[PDB]
RNA sequence: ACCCCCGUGCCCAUAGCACUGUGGAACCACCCCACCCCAUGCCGAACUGGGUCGUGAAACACAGCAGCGCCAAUGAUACUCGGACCGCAGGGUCCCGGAAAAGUCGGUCAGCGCGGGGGU
RNA sequence: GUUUGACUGGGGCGGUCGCCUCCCAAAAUGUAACGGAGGCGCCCAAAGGUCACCUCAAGACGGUUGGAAAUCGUCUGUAGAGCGCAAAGGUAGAAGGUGGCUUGACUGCGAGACUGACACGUCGAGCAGGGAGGAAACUCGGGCUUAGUGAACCGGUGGUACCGUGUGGAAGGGCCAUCGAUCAACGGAUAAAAGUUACCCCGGGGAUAACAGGCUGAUCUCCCCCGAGAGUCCAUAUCGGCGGGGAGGUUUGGCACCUCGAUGUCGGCUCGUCGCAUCCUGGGGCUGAAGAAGGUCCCAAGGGUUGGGCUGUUCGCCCAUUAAAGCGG
RNA sequence: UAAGGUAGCGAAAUUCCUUGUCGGGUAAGUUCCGACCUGCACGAAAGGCGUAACGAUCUGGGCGC
RNA sequence: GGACCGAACCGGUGCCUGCUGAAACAGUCUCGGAUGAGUUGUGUUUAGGAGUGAAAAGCUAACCGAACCUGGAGAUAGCUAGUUCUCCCCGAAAUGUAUUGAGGUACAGCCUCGGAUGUUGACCAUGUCCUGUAGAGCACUCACAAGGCUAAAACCUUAUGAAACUCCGAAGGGGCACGCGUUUAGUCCGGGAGUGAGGCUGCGAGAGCUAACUUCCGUAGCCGAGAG
């Protein structure tokens, strides 16, 4: 009635204004606190990862619906 | 006792198997799927064993 | 007194109270000055004193309420299994929080009734009539 | 160039709801019919296929309006990085920057593209 | 001949040992407790691929069985539902509810990243072979995610034709699939194992219990505030509900600080000495104090405080006395 | 559960509650004797209940000193 | 006559004394047996997991739950002690995960040395992004105070509590860039380690009495190894 618990690191991993290489993981989350943006892909656990290299950037609108996205260099 | 056993499927005249746990509840009738074996393209693997 | 409710046990610390610094109901009000827990029978003794002095008349409101469980380990054991399942319910009380307030009783009799009730509370406390008020 | 309609985006409640008024032969809408393309675990109600008329009834479009939502200051306070203290203790104070939540004043019933249709 | 786990506010008994979710966790991640709550050791040939369609809880009014909730109809209706199991995130342009065809619940790979001491664990664009659904863009290498698990060794089975001891074979082995783990003490000592010692031994520990001391003071002992009533009448002569505040450190305890290369423990005897919260004596106030005999509070620690029966007893009960037969260090 | 104590004895070298309750003894008896039974958890050859005599045995009383 | 009293003799009951003794088991006093299952001499036989034993695990050459001597043998010792000449430079750990593991050990972390790069380090500023704590608030869940309406539920006014509530939500904190500006480390490679028992205080919590020179985490500093 006490002994139990468990430890699974989660969170944003690549924050806005950072230069991700493509295939980088940018957020680990359990649901859709972030929705995959333009240039972003989301795997089974709703991880968001770079589709192509660029500047990571965040779009915030109402915390029901914000999105991570890539603005490529060049 | 035991319920949903592990079932190996011989490919249709191939040489390779696939193995998966077809539940023995509703899946009373032997498995017949399709899969790519040793040779050609997808063919009928008969999960009898 | 005891609530009919939810999770058995809790924690504890403090900061000055917000949820009732002003006397809405009634005329006069006794009011806490110190941050103790108040809990159950302490209040109920306040209630039974004031109801003796006043009843057949007056309106008695108890704006405070024994929300918070508090625990006692058994008897005499070592720091052992878990915490102790029961013991008494309390109400945290921060200064400016209003516990009591009478209605339909003359100023002086409310003085004497607040005096009796406050002679059995862990905190010292001050009474007041309601100034001008807002918050509606 | 002015007007309005049909689509369609950016922005997605300061742009939403309620009460109200205005539109029909441009446009949209209801509407008529349906054995069949097609279709409802029953019903052409909805998908669907052929078309007037009629009617803007409902819908939709536009306009009014601040009852409701939504936005939301200033003053101050809560709390607090940092600095220095008090109380035996629960707990409290001071200087220095940071600074809410709520609530009051007020603000709104949007704003900005692309096209195509029809008016003048 | 051996085995007979560990944690553990001493050890034992009890409980626990891997994995998931929330709080603790101090707005990054991480963070302990025999802290506070709850679940897993599965499930689903469709609850999966895809492709098409539908939208929930709840309430009100109205209606055959009904009579609060069934079924049907209108109205309101960011979700108050649902999501196979727990909880959390997420979710209505669905991940929810229903039908069509289907197996990608694929083979060979893996840019680049999350996470871990390691070994593990997670996500993943994109390339080929070959498929599935869609008219198409395109989606598919199991499931809305997060638990449903087990290194290695040793072996069962099916392929493959690497090895194979003079040579050609074969026996045997290897490579690819795959079967065997409450090895749950869940990084798993052997394939294989329980007790007892007061007959006990060794190495160690004040890293850790029993005595005592220390720190604390819940429990213990004692004093104070209020004043409900009792006291015929009057709260306070005496008593004082329900409640509040303190002191002491003599009780049982918590904690584990010096002492385990030793601080001898109950009771008696002997010898003392100290506190005072005073049993007697001495002085005072008040009394529900006429006298006498008392009650209770204040001052007071000079001295005094008996002999026996029972019991190891300390206590306590009793006998017979007493001014008194005090309580503690 | 295969059954559930026949005689005997019982607060006992066994009894926890306990100094059980009554009585005897004593001025006074947590011990000891006798009764009772409510036997925490007596009992028939790990023998039950008695028993004269014996005992550097253990327990309680008395006289003498 | 496994009868009585009682010397010798065999014994060892109770008290004292002795306790660096007269003595490594005794002395005085007292006491048991004393024709018997008795006492005693010489010779001789049984021994080490073995003998013997009217049975204590007794005795087996002054300490027997398995004798002594030599040998294997310097057994093994996650345990305790001890480990010696000088000055100079740097300088820790008492954390993490794993362990028939818990006072042991492996890996990492932190120390030092040599090589390589050669400002990538540190602080503080601006820009940007992330977060749900302090506070606050009742919009949901649970709890909850006085009224109203009412077949009590819902619903209206007034009014609160929250670790496992959140319409909101700071100060701070973390990543990245840049240096717009000061400083001086950083990283990679290879040799040698030790540490893995920590302690106190302030702030933030849990367990505990909002007890402890209490206990378990977080964070800053000192002790540890710091004299003045
Ligand atoms: C007095 C008689 C003997 O002592 C004891 O019995 C006992 C003495 C102590 C009190 C005791 O300590 C106690 O231990 C406890 C476990 C702990 C306790 N702590 C708390 C302090 C401690 O106090 C012991 C272990 C200490 C230790 C040094 C020891 O072993 C001493 C041994 C012998 O010398 C003594 C004798 O004096 C020898 O007398 C012998 O008596 C025979 C009958 C004679 O034939 C003769 O033998 C020929 C003679 O001589 C040998
Ligand atoms: Mg406070
Ligand atoms: Mg404050
Ligand atoms: Mg308020
Ligand atoms: Mg339009
Ligand atoms: Mg209208
Ligand atoms: Mg016209
Ligand atoms: Mg129609
Ligand atoms: Mg109209
Ligand atoms: Mg301001
Ligand atoms: Mg400052
Ligand atoms: Mg400060
Ligand atoms: Mg300030
Ligand atoms: Mg505001
Ligand atoms: Mg409008
Ligand atoms: Mg236009
Ligand atoms: Mg051996
Ligand atoms: Mg152990
Ligand atoms: Mg348990
Ligand atoms: Mg965190
Ligand atoms: Mg933090
Ligand atoms: Mg830790
Ligand atoms: Mg707790
Ligand atoms: Mg769907
Ligand atoms: Mg096709
Ligand atoms: Mg792919
Ligand atoms: Mg084989
Ligand atoms: Mg050959
Ligand atoms: Mg072969
Ligand atoms: Mg383990
Ligand atoms: Mg094994
Ligand atoms: Mg075993
Ligand atoms: Mg014995
Ligand atoms: Mg012995
Ligand atoms: Mg020893
Ligand atoms: Mg030592
Ligand atoms: Mg110690
Ligand atoms: Mg230890
Ligand atoms: Mg001792
Ligand atoms: Mg004790
Ligand atoms: Mg002690
Ligand atoms: Mg001492
Ligand atoms: Mg008290
Ligand atoms: Mg003590
Ligand atoms: Mg300690
Ligand atoms: Mg010594
Ligand atoms: Mg002792
Ligand atoms: Mg005095
Ligand atoms: Mg007197
Ligand atoms: Mg008199
Ligand atoms: Mg006496
Ligand atoms: Mg006598
Ligand atoms: Mg004395
Ligand atoms: Mg008797
Ligand atoms: Mg007895
Ligand atoms: Mg008598
Ligand atoms: Mg008697
Ligand atoms: Mg006796
Ligand atoms: Mg008797
Ligand atoms: Mg018997
Ligand atoms: Mg027998
Ligand atoms: Mg016999
Ligand atoms: Mg007998
Ligand atoms: Mg004899
Ligand atoms: Mg005797
Ligand atoms: Mg006698
Ligand atoms: Mg004879
Ligand atoms: Mg003899
Ligand atoms: Mg002799
Ligand atoms: Mg004789
Ligand atoms: Mg004789
Ligand atoms: Mg033998
Ligand atoms: Mg000997
Ligand atoms: Mg000799
Ligand atoms: Mg030996
Ligand atoms: Mg040696
Ligand atoms: Mg050897
Ligand atoms: Mg050994
Ligand atoms: Mg130095
Ligand atoms: Mg692990
Ligand atoms: Mg260790
Ligand atoms: Mg190392
Ligand atoms: Mg170097
Ligand atoms: Mg760097
Ligand atoms: Mg730099
Ligand atoms: Mg708060
Ligand atoms: Mg608002
Ligand atoms: Mg520079
Ligand atoms: Mg190295
Ligand atoms: Mg060296
Ligand atoms: Mg440690
Ligand atoms: Mg520590
Ligand atoms: Mg507590
Ligand atoms: Mg400590
Ligand atoms: Mg040290
Ligand atoms: Mg110093
Ligand atoms: Mg230092
Ligand atoms: Mg000094």
Cα→Cα distances C59→C31, C55, C56, C106, C128, Å? 17, 8, 10, 12, 17
Q: How was this structure determined?
A: X-ray
Q: Is residue C13 part of a domain?
A: no
Extract the runs of DSSP E, i.e. beta strands, from A29-64: 35-36, 40-42, 48-50, 54-61
Indicate the burial class of C23 (C-beta count within 10 angstroms; 0-12, 13-18, 19 or more). buried
Tokens for C91?
């109400």
Query: How far is CA C114 from its chain centroid?
Result: 13
CA-to-C1' distance for B48 and E101, Å?
25
Strand partners, C125: C32
Which DSSP string corresponds to B18-34?
Answer: --B---TTT--SPEEEE
The CA–C1' separation of A58 and F43, in angstroms, is: 93
Residue C1 lies in a domain: no
Strands C59-62 and B43-47: unpaired
Taking the C-alpha atoms of residue C30 and residue C23, their distance in angstroms, rounded to an integer, is: 9
CA dist C58 and C103 (Å) reads 5
Chain D, protein-covered positions (CB within 7 A): 11-13, 78-79, 90-92
| Dihedral class, residue C38 (left if φ above 0, else alpha if ψ from -120 to 50, else beta) | alpha
- Please state whether B26 falls in left (phi above 0), alpha (psi between -120 and 50) or beta: alpha
Resolution in A: 3.3
Strand G at less than 7 A from CB of C75? no
Structure tokens at A45: 């656990």
What span, in angstroms and rounded, lies between the C-alpha atoms of A43 and A56?
18
DSSP string, chain C: ---S-S-S----------TT-S--SSSEEEEE-S--B--THHHHHHHHHHHHHHTTS-EEEE-----EEEE---TT--S-SS--S-EEEE-B--TT-B-EEEESS-HHHHHHHHHHHHTTSSS-EEEEE--S----
C36 touches strand D (CB under 7 A): yes
3-state SS, A1-24, equals: CCCCCCCCCCEECCCCCCEECCCC
Domain ranges of chain A: 10-74
In angstroms, the CA A19 to CA C30 distance is 63
Number of independent structural domains in chain C: 1
């Amino acid at each position: 009635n006490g002994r139990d618990s468990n430890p699974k690191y989660l969170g944003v991993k690549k924050f806005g204004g950072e230069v991700v290489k493509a295939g980088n993981i940018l957020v680990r989350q359990r649901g859709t606190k972030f929705k995959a943006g333009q240039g972003v892909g989301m795997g089974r656990d709703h991880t968001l990862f770079a589709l192509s290299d660029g500047k990571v950037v965040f779009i915030n609108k109402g915390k029901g619906a914000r999105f991570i996205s890539i603005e490529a260099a060049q | 006792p035991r319920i949903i056993v592990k079932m190996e499927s011989s490919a249709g005249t191939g040489f390779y198997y696939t193995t998966t746990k077809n539940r023995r509840n509703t899946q009373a009738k032997l498995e017949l799927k399709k899969y790519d074996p040793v040779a050609k393209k997808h063919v009928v693997f008969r999960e009898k064993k | 007194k005891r609530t009919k409710f939810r999770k058995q046990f809790r924690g504890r610390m403090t900061g000055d109270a917000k949820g009732g610094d002003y006397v809405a109901f009634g005329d006069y009000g006794l009011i806490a000055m110190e941050p103790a827990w108040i809990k159950s029978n302490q209040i109920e003794a306040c209630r039974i004193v004031m109801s003796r002095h006043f009843r057949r008349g007056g309106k008695i409101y108890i704006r405070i309420f024994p929300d918070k469980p508090v625990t006692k380990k058994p008897a005499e054991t070592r720091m052992g299994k878990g915490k102790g399942a029961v013991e008494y319910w309390v109400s945290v009380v921060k200064p400016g929080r209003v516990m009591f307030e009478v209605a339909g009783v003359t100023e002086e009799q409310a003085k004497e009734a607040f005096r009796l009730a406050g002679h059995k509370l862990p905190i010292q406390t001050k009474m007041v009539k309601r100034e001008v008020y807002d918050e509606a």
